[PDB]
């Protein structure tokens, strides 16, 4: 906060995603349903791109589901992770990488804005 | 019905997704599991693109999960939204925007058709 | 095993995804939560691409959720499908197509590797 996406890092040079961590310690239970986790990272995105927030596989396998999120090109708010404990109680420590941002080309169309 | 994807609209000029609404009022409960919601919008998609159906974040946070769906380039059927109430009873009013279509480049490969 | 992604096939010429089958018969129950299903298919991916593993819609509607998975460009391990039975007991027969691989352009950025 406020940190831009240029501050994120890749696990490795060939990693498709930029890792996202929560800035808070959060405990999630299945009955809580979707929770929006703060990242302290803000849009916007590089020109002609949009973002997809996806889970990391190791986190998904530990029972924390990240719902795929679309980040619009010109979003300037805080990127949050939408997360749910699937079956069990899940504990997110401050700073642990819990999702990833993928950048994709934004295709232009003639669809109207409405 | 039958309406083509060119009829969809963007929330804003920089919105990555084209919004999809259900043409029916639908109530979903968790025990129902995945339901396919009618949109009255039909493929196919622009040349060299395919589609991804994703949830809208505000709808996801209200407890309606949209399962990511792939729309093939030459699909000419009705685009449906695969949806589930996560934890609670969810009510979809006719016309409310419940998902979004994202267009992505379709990469060509030499993989066989089988 | 070890089979490369070039061995996968498309349902049809205009299908966005390359189908993935499990090499094992697997039974899944909701209380099991996420399971990683073996495919016997291995990265890496074509240059300048990364992969997304998504469910097939017919499988999603039958109550088997595939969590979207990111496949890094230079991953050389086995591509596994992360799957959960949503509400009911689901049975995956050996060889049935249970997910699909989508290839997408890998955008280069100046983000650091850390
Ligand atoms: O996982 C997410 C998804 C969205 N977002 C932010 C960025 C995105 O540009 C913004 C809007 O997201 P979506 O459109 O999915 N949401 P919705 O349609 O409900 O809001 P709007 O009508 O403003 O587009 O919410 C996140 O921070 N995390
Ligand atoms: O959310 C979705 C997903 C798919 N679809 C439609 C468009 C897509 O081209 C078509 C086939 O989808 P998938 O392949 O995911 N499905 P499946 O592999 O089960 O059917 P097929 O063997 O015909 O490809 O179903 C939707 O309408 N909504
Ligand atoms: O559904 C999936 C997701 C990932 N994978 C493999 C390929 C991918 O390159 C590798 C790493 O995946 P992610 O990064 O999502 N995982 P995580 O961040 O937990 O591991 P790492 O720190 O190595 O990137 O796991 C699959 O086989 N199936
Ligand atoms: Mg990773
Ligand atoms: Mg929106
Ligand atoms: Mg298919």
Coordinates of C-alpha atoms in Angstrom, one line a residue, chain B:
Chain B
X1 CA -32.4 -15.4 -28.2
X2 CA -31.0 -15.8 -30.6
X3 CA -28.7 -12.9 -29.8
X4 CA -25.0 -12.9 -30.9
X5 CA -22.1 -11.9 -28.7
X6 CA -21.9 -8.5 -30.5
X7 CA -25.0 -7.6 -28.4
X8 CA -23.2 -7.8 -25.1
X9 CA -21.9 -4.7 -23.4
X10 CA -18.9 -3.7 -21.3
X11 CA -19.4 -2.0 -17.9
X12 CA -16.8 0.5 -18.9
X13 CA -14.4 1.0 -21.8
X14 CA -11.5 -0.6 -19.9
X15 CA -13.6 -3.6 -18.6
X16 CA -12.1 -6.9 -19.7
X17 CA -15.4 -8.8 -19.7
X18 CA -18.6 -8.6 -21.5
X19 CA -21.4 -9.0 -19.1
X20 CA -23.8 -11.9 -19.2
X21 CA -27.2 -11.9 -17.5
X22 CA -29.7 -14.8 -17.0
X23 CA -32.9 -14.6 -18.9
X24 CA -34.6 -16.4 -16.0
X25 CA -35.3 -15.9 -12.4
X26 CA -33.4 -18.7 -10.7
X27 CA -33.1 -19.7 -7.0
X28 CA -30.0 -21.8 -6.2
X29 CA -29.3 -23.7 -3.0
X30 CA -26.0 -25.4 -2.1
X31 CA -27.5 -28.9 -2.3
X32 CA -28.5 -28.3 -5.9
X33 CA -24.9 -28.2 -7.1
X34 CA -24.0 -26.9 -10.6
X35 CA -26.8 -25.4 -12.6
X36 CA -26.6 -24.1 -16.2
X37 CA -28.2 -20.7 -16.4
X38 CA -29.6 -19.5 -19.8
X39 CA -28.3 -16.3 -21.2
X40 CA -30.1 -16.1 -24.6
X41 CA -26.6 -15.2 -26.1
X42 CA -25.1 -17.5 -28.7
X43 CA -21.7 -18.1 -30.2
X44 CA -19.7 -18.1 -32.4
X45 CA -16.8 -15.9 -31.4
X46 CA -14.6 -13.5 -33.4
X47 CA -12.1 -15.2 -35.6
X48 CA -9.0 -16.5 -33.8
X49 CA -10.5 -16.0 -30.4
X50 CA -12.1 -18.2 -27.8
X51 CA -14.1 -17.3 -24.7
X52 CA -13.8 -17.7 -20.9
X53 CA -16.9 -17.3 -18.8
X54 CA -15.9 -16.1 -15.3
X55 CA -17.9 -14.8 -12.3
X56 CA -18.2 -11.1 -11.6
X57 CA -16.5 -10.4 -8.3
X58 CA -19.5 -8.7 -6.7
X59 CA -21.6 -11.8 -7.5
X60 CA -18.9 -14.2 -6.3
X61 CA -18.7 -12.3 -3.0
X62 CA -22.5 -12.7 -2.6
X63 CA -22.1 -16.4 -2.6
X64 CA -22.7 -17.4 -6.2
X65 CA -19.9 -19.3 -7.7
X66 CA -19.5 -19.3 -11.5
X67 CA -17.4 -22.2 -12.7
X68 CA -15.0 -21.0 -15.3
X69 CA -16.2 -22.1 -18.7
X70 CA -14.4 -22.3 -22.0
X71 CA -16.3 -21.2 -25.1
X72 CA -14.9 -22.6 -28.3
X73 CA -14.4 -20.4 -31.3
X74 CA -17.0 -22.1 -33.4
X75 CA -19.5 -22.9 -30.8
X76 CA -22.9 -21.8 -32.1
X77 CA -25.1 -22.9 -29.2
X78 CA -26.3 -20.8 -26.3
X79 CA -23.7 -19.6 -23.9
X80 CA -24.7 -20.8 -20.5
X81 CA -23.4 -19.9 -17.1
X82 CA -22.5 -22.8 -14.8
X83 CA -23.3 -21.6 -11.3
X84 CA -23.5 -22.9 -7.8
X85 CA -24.7 -21.4 -4.5
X86 CA -21.7 -21.8 -2.3
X87 CA -23.1 -21.7 1.2
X88 CA -26.4 -20.0 1.3
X89 CA -29.5 -19.7 -0.8
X90 CA -28.9 -17.4 -3.7
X91 CA -31.6 -15.6 -5.8
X92 CA -30.9 -14.6 -9.4
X93 CA -33.3 -12.0 -10.8
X94 CA -34.1 -12.0 -14.5
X95 CA -31.6 -9.6 -16.1
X96 CA -29.1 -9.3 -13.3
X97 CA -25.5 -9.6 -14.6
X98 CA -24.2 -12.8 -13.2
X99 CA -21.0 -13.5 -15.2
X100 CA -18.7 -12.1 -17.8
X101 CA -17.3 -13.3 -21.0
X102 CA -13.6 -12.7 -21.6
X103 CA -12.1 -13.1 -25.2
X104 CA -8.6 -14.5 -25.5
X105 CA -6.4 -15.4 -28.5
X106 CA -6.8 -18.9 -29.8
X107 CA -3.3 -20.3 -30.3
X108 CA -2.9 -22.7 -33.1
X109 CA -0.9 -25.9 -32.5
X110 CA -0.3 -29.1 -34.4
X111 CA -2.2 -31.3 -31.9
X112 CA -4.4 -33.8 -33.7
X113 CA -8.3 -33.7 -33.6
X114 CA -9.4 -36.9 -31.9

